[PDB]
């Protein structure tokens, strides 16, 4: 079908793009930032808010003390209780959502480490501990683009893989207590 | 390149190939007319399947659809009690075994609503439902190494949405674009 | 203990003030607006978002087709699909949260009816369909106030009672269906 | 107007009952338990989940590290990461909602301290660190009852006030940081 083709092309295109963006040493660094962090936070709005919730679900099941926030007040009250043992991962596909960029800046002022995920090379000039570049959507118009989560989910999974192999014995045992009840 | 990076990327590409196989262009085209047809659309799911339900709500409301996503059983119960034949429920259960979802689809049918189930496991119990959409399985046998549980569903969501937007498009594109109108006080501008 | 007495005094004072604020005719009108509307929206942020969510829960069980939204994008996308048959209830205790005031102005431009709940009167609110005055708190310092939901819960409960007596038999049946032996998800 | 009086009587009745049920020493203890805890969890379903969400909002702004959980999957994954530095507050007005009773039991097994809030006493809550009795409602028919949050909000506000006075200076600094010139109010 012609519409079926557009969707599957958008999928393989961002697949094809994601291949070229992957910085494996950056991803293993982030996995280590998570392991070393005491408290970990995921910020995003809209569909990037859904990505942040997905991450909370998966890493909490490997034993991570974390929390997903998806609005401005939640960002403000949460950054006000961060310190140097915290890590914040911010998700913003455009790179331009002010609540996310401002909340990463607030977290940095409190000494937290910061990671921004975005499809737009940052203009902030290496302001955050890390900036993970994700695929851009192929479709030019917002209305026909595929799930905004997808560029982010790729890197979700990649970091998940690297993180699972740090201290896995302790993490597989936490994962499996769910089925064992 | 890395082995871990290697395992993740073939998980993605295998479900791209297995998805490619499972599509039924005409079933998804049908499911698209049911959303237009319904007056009230509900999306039900738990865990990661709830996140899929939340995303459908976000995308279809922006095309003008009256809809709501629910993600625990009490919301299923109270919501099904106000359904009628002009209601459509989409239920998401990758395992196909989550009782809260199967039971609330049975509940929705009782009220006369049309019903669609999304699952990686086929069955004959789902014959009760108006449609059953078959989605890709993951490939990692280890549940803990599987890639994100949303993905088999996001494919078919993207497919149905692609179809849905071409039904009565002018007015759906109007509603979508209003978020960027300069008059919209809570809009993107701000 | 004086702490204990201070908290309890806050609850008593709120209840006294609420009685002094009630306009029963207005509350009856608002009950009627809910019943007449085809779709009802509850808008709030922070503690006022929780108020909105509870109202959605209780009125859904009486058959109302309704939704609670608690952020700016939810407000914008929802107002863009409103019409003459919709009703928006906005909760802002301070009466000044811009997203809420703006969301009701956007709703009004789509033809929808609008109700603002606030503890701070204003002549700017003159533009909405109804303005419901709720109680202020009685602790001068914000950090010692009791829950910010409470002024609103009083009036939600008043509206609920008036509403339940409008075509009650049909609403009590929907509410009772949750306990029906046929109801699978139900307890 | 008989309606208006009924709703107001329900509020007054609950205030009067709440005062009779308060155990001031227990509340100070729970306030001290929250401070002493490293991580605090609030569990509730339905209206009791909104109560838990508001507790999270208010105690976080005083510097508490906490999270609210309002469904069964969330409870299990959270208990599987608890330990002795943890406190969980469980809200069940009926006292009989199984996901709440069970998961609090899981949490004690993990080493966590436990607090059930309920309006129905029971001897099989004697396994928890604390049981806070809250007020029942005063309407016979469930459909005519006031917000189900209210019995819990009374006691949450009591605990809040006790807690605010432990190390108040540092808590007021965190609370006020929301109004400092830093980004995102
Ligand atoms: C272009 C557009 O529609 N944006 C809306 C959402 O689709 C998006 O998910 C969210 C976060 O956007 P991000 O921060 O760029 O991810 O912002 C807006 O809600
Ligand atoms: C299936 C599983 O192992 N773990 C959780 C999620 O990953 C899952 O998405 C959801 C079940 O919903 P399902 O998709 O119908 O299975 O909740 C499960 O507890
Ligand atoms: C002063 C302050 O700290 N306000 C916060 C919340 O306590 C409040 O619930 C919300 C709603 O404000 P409202 O619109 O006046 O109800 O705004 C902020 O999130
Ligand atoms: C009797 C009834 O309708 N119960 C429903 C809710 O109103 C209640 O808020 C929740 C928690 O029950 P609780 O655990 O006793 O607080 O359970 C059910 O959703
Ligand atoms: Na695309
Ligand atoms: Na896979
Ligand atoms: Na007060
Ligand atoms: Na009552």
mmCIF file of C-alpha atoms and ligand atoms in Angstrom, chain B residues 7-8 10-12 14-15 137-140 145-148, ligand 6:
data_model
loop_
_atom_site.group_PDB
_atom_site.id
_atom_site.type_symbol
_atom_site.label_atom_id
_atom_site.label_comp_id
_atom_site.label_asym_id
_atom_site.label_seq_id
_atom_site.Cartn_x
_atom_site.Cartn_y
_atom_site.Cartn_z
ATOM 1 C CA UNK B 7 22.452 -7.504 20.122
ATOM 2 C CA UNK B 8 20.187 -4.411 20.460
ATOM 3 C CA UNK B 10 19.416 -6.847 15.445
ATOM 4 C CA UNK B 11 16.515 -7.028 17.917
ATOM 5 C CA UNK B 12 15.282 -3.822 16.233
ATOM 6 C CA UNK B 14 14.344 -8.556 13.265
ATOM 7 C CA UNK B 15 11.060 -6.994 14.569
ATOM 8 C CA UNK B 137 7.188 -10.897 19.130
ATOM 9 C CA UNK B 138 10.493 -9.861 20.637
ATOM 10 C CA UNK B 139 13.499 -12.043 19.896
ATOM 11 C CA UNK B 140 15.449 -12.101 23.118
ATOM 12 C CA UNK B 145 17.243 -8.454 27.680
ATOM 13 C CA UNK B 146 14.212 -7.675 25.562
ATOM 14 C CA UNK B 147 14.017 -4.306 23.855
ATOM 15 C CA UNK B 148 11.338 -1.820 24.835
HETATM 16 NA NA1 LIG E 6 13.704 -8.213 20.630
#
